[PDB]
Symmetry: D2
Subunit: 332 residues, 4 copies
């Protein structure tokens, strides 16, 4: 006469093939920041955590599990084996190779490719219809890798791209103008990293172009040196790592926001990393960050931003560089 | 004129006194997990971080700031100087001594005393009307310590106590019964730790006493061994720490929940650590966890839970140990 | 081409199929209150409204649409035709007959049945796998009716039952005690309306039985007349209606809560109207409120509250009243 | 020993002012839509309702209170007496007179003046440091009227103005583009209603300007007739009132949104009605919607939009019009 049976009359066996499942792969600082941000935004009804560090994984699962009372996400699960990711709508990849000391860039990427050779086909094995959000760096290359390896079409392979950079850019713009980042508008596009392009033309508060008001905006002869806002944006992770060891919170919140649009089919515009063969004269299979319309089918549409000859040329060289690295990769 | 000034006409520069300020002291895993939990429950319009480790501190402030666009808490600040804590409604203390192994428990607590000797007066100096929430372990003792130093009335010196213990209990009650923990009710009370008391009489679902349904509940002769549920509660922070190195997420979510009741004046009942001289035949100046009505002035009232003789003894022995340590502390 | 085509490049013209769609039938005060509350708890990616009064339905739909910028439900539709309700996960029925002075209680029910005879098969035509949440009054009878007409299994046909009854009961308990209704616990069960049963035995705060503490709780020799609290609960709708005309807000919030559990698979326990044939010595196909576990499959399990024979007699009496009314109803 | 004696040990009370109190005046559809939206965005620890029908008031207070368990706002109060409003941080005024069939524009705003002479003094009496948010129409004038009667600094007297007009604009712009309104940007400014101004130059998505991409946009010759997006915004309340009797939900959300900025000090930029004597030729004490920075002190700063001479003219004509009415008023 077990106590559960005395208390509760069961009415229904049925399995629970879950309806709004998100999986996070990799439980480091970035991964778990993505996890807590997702849980606290009530975006998913089952969350799956996957890593190879078995004891650390289990710790992070239990710790979240213990906060269940303060959450609205009834099922939290974890494991090294990818069957715990089955039927995910969205799979967020934070996993990668850790940096070796004298290691060439290619080699770092190659070793990420070797890891993705194992992860990605396990992810598609269990969630054939999911969306892949790649966070792992270098993100515009690793999004190409997940694309190639998965074979998913381009709308369901998304890189976190410059989504965060644009966030930092707005924060900083805000703190100059004394106005909330929500009301300060501006776009960092192209390659996530040192070569990202701050589109000055597009910066506005309430539709009032900063570029028109201050024509020297973004340039050398700019006496307010607004390019330092960009320099800050690019330097930002470095300085944060220099200070606290890693970064986590910002990238967590940023990925949670991309998930919001996807999981709730919002059709919001985010600058994320997407295939752009065809656009800006770029002829290579290369992912770059461009404002995209995000929804239940991933990237459904993208926004053709008017770019200058100068800004177009930046994007083209980012692609040249990326391809140069991408064509020395080994997938077999 | 500047760009700022061609774009924005200022009507009044005028001083901000902040209106719902929360300060968090100590930016290790526990402290930051409280800070992210609070940012995401929009409980505060200003969040101040304080620690002595300046690199870590600036790093965390910058990282949170960088996700501002995704938050509705417009000012985040930090510093080693408690002037940044000014006019806080609530001050959460996670700071403490690093354990030294060898160390007697007494000496460990005395070093915490000496830290609080510096911290607590600075806090009250800058936010004389705040509520203090102590999270630092050993929490039932350190809440007494903060009270004796602050000279605040007991209603505004609150230990996080068995709030999380009780959430763990309910999560576990939950996975056994197949019901969300929000709907599983049971209270861990008394000393936060080994000696905590699981009040079986109070364990219910939909107001059905489990103890009346299965009288063996919480006894050696219990066939379903529900006593193991309490054992898992007692040992979770050990099991999680052993597995992932620290604990953070559950405590953060837990402490944000206390902060919600305080900041929004809800007068909900949480089991937190407070002065119980008088209750359950306790004669000494001891804090322990009892269900308390939390609101804008902190603890307004406490619930007189009926305990068995056995439970009342467990609790009294608890206060006797707590007093055995406290009577050996050095304040002046 | 056009502006849209110049701005936005399209990767993908899109299947549709909304993933978390909710339909509200009837756009009176109760329906719109349910709708606004659902929209503000970010529970659905598509909201569909259905009434017979065309101008009203379109005006409300437009009004909601114009707040789209402050919400997160990208698609809001309406129509006379149930084709706007396709692929709903939850269809919430508020529709019913307007009372006519001097009409018997039976003819009122029948007229409601003639409506359901049109509505229910349309709801299943287009959402064969939805859950039905009936709100229309009399709720326990009209739940049975929807159950019969739909042919759905019983787990997927739910009446709002004594859900709000117990909210009001908790609110009142709260005023008396000085404590948020969240921390006061009490269940009103059975037939929604004059014969509902306040289960004194289960009333607690912090898991302390008010009944044990105050043995006369709920009797006529009760010095504190706690019996009045239930009478307040039973009579509140009348009293609000008398003051403002209808009730709307509290019912809407109570419906949004039940959707939250269903749409998010929470498995929280709510006192809702379900089929209790086989309990409390009841052999008739009858629906009454009893505490139920709500999830993505609707009512998966239910709680067996222990009732005193007085309490058990009221449920049995209601089961006879209801059936003697139901056996007279006309459908097939 | 009561039950309460047996169950609750009580501690020495300390006193309690409410910390984030919002008052809403007038509990027709618009008042209550504002009330439920504020309740559901956890913006206050206390909500006060005030009107003149005691029955409707007590009913809406009870019906709300009954859903307390599902909310995080622990005190809801109502009454004809303005002391239920004491210590409000923000007072939202939806009260006013319905224009009657045979009634001029001058007598309407004069009746509203007289009603405001009763309400506003009472509001400042019990809550002298509040921000007033005027929602009542004709709003750009009544905002001016609240200002005059309260004697508040211009920063604490805010009119809802084109905050909803802009949101409707963005919804409609959204429908055409297949993009959510959050990501669609366009601003409606000036006198609320038929004479509002849609700033076509500022319309964008991800910072790509629509007017540069499609120079006819908003002119008549425009083959896609984008001008009708604004015309729709102008005739939306009319079209909805026609269809359901009134407008409530949209305005309610719009107002909560302004309330979120004020109550949480966000310094977000909302097109709201403010005293813009000094800009655009305007040399009169007139309130029109400009984009404004809203925080805890109300309107701290404002954005100087670059306007066409034609857009400038519409504002200036509005300002004349309004002063032409305000000068006949008597306080
Ligand atoms: C043959 O089966 C197979 N199993 C696991 C993996 C594999 C490897 C690394 C992973 C990997 N990272 C990892 C593991 C070990 C060393 C290093 C390093 O710094 O070089 C990096 C992760 S991660 N980043 O922890 O989420 C998650 N999953 C991983 C899975 C694999 O890939 C090469 N192949
Ligand atoms: C009166 O001068 C004075 N100033 C600061 C402190 C003082 C000491 C430790 C603090 C202290 N902790 C502490 C001490 C020693 C080592 C470590 C560590 O993390 O490794 C940490 C903290 S905190 N928040 O835990 O980081 C915060 N504030 C502190 C302040 C003090 O107490 C000794 N006395
Ligand atoms: C088979 O054809 C058919 N079409 C529509 C209806 C029908 C009737 C009332 C509805 C009905 N109520 C209604 C309509 C007209 C009069 C009255 C009254 O009793 O005063 C009540 C609703 S409603 N407003 O959403 O509750 C929604 N849908 C309804 C649909 C129907 O019902 C018998 N049958
Ligand atoms: C001098 O005493 C005095 N008491 C109340 C009022 C007064 C008037 C209208 C109010 C008023 N409007 C109102 C009241 C009665 C009738 C009508 C109508 O046009 O049919 C309009 C409201 S309101 N709009 O309901 O929130 C709220 N409070 C009001 C208060 C007053 O104004 C002249 N003067």
């Amino acid at each position: 006469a077990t106590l559960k049976d005395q208390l509760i009359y069961n009415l229904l066996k049925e399995e629970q093939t879950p309806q709004n499942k998100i999986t996070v792969v990799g439980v480091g600082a970035v991964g778990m920041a993505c996890a807590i941000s997702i849980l606290m935004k009530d975006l998913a009804d089952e969350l799956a955590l996957v890593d190879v560090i078995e004891d650390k994984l289990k710790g992070e699962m239990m710790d979240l599990q213990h906060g269940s009372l303060f959450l609205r996400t009834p099922k939290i699960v974890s494991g090294k084996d990818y069957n715990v990711t089955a039927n995910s709508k969205l799979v967020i990849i934070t996993a990668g190779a850790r940096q070796q000391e004298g290691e060439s860039r290619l080699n770092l990427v190659q070793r990420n490719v070797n890891i993705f050779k194992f992860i990605i086909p396990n992810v598609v094995k269990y969630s054939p219809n999911c969306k892949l959000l790649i966070v792992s760096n270098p993100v515009d290359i690793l999004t190409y890798v997940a694309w190639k390896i998965s074979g998913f079409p381009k709308n369901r392979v998304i890189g976190s791209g410059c989504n965060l950079d644009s966030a930092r850019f707005r924060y900083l713009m805000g703190e100059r103008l004394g106005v909330h980042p929500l009301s300060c508008h501006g776009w960092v596009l192209g390659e996530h990293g040192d070569s990202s392009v701050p589109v000055w033309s597009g910066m506005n508060v309430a539709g009032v172009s900063l570029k028109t008001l201050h024509p020297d905006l973004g340039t050398d002869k700019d006496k307010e040196q607004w390019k330092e806002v960009h320099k800050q944006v690019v330097e930002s992770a470095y300085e944060v790592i220099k200070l606290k060891g890693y970064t986590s919170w910002a990238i967590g919140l940023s990925v949670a926001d991309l998930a919001e649009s996807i999981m709730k089919n919002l059709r919001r515009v985010h600058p994320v990393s997407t295939m752009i063969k065809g656009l800006y004269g770029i002829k290579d299979d290369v992912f770059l960050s461009v404002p995209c319309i995000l929804g239940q089918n991933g990237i459904s549409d993208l926004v053709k931003v008017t770019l200058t000859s100068e800004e177009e040329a930046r994007l083209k060289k980012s692609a040249d560089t990326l391809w140069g690295i991408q064509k020395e990769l080994q997938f077999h």
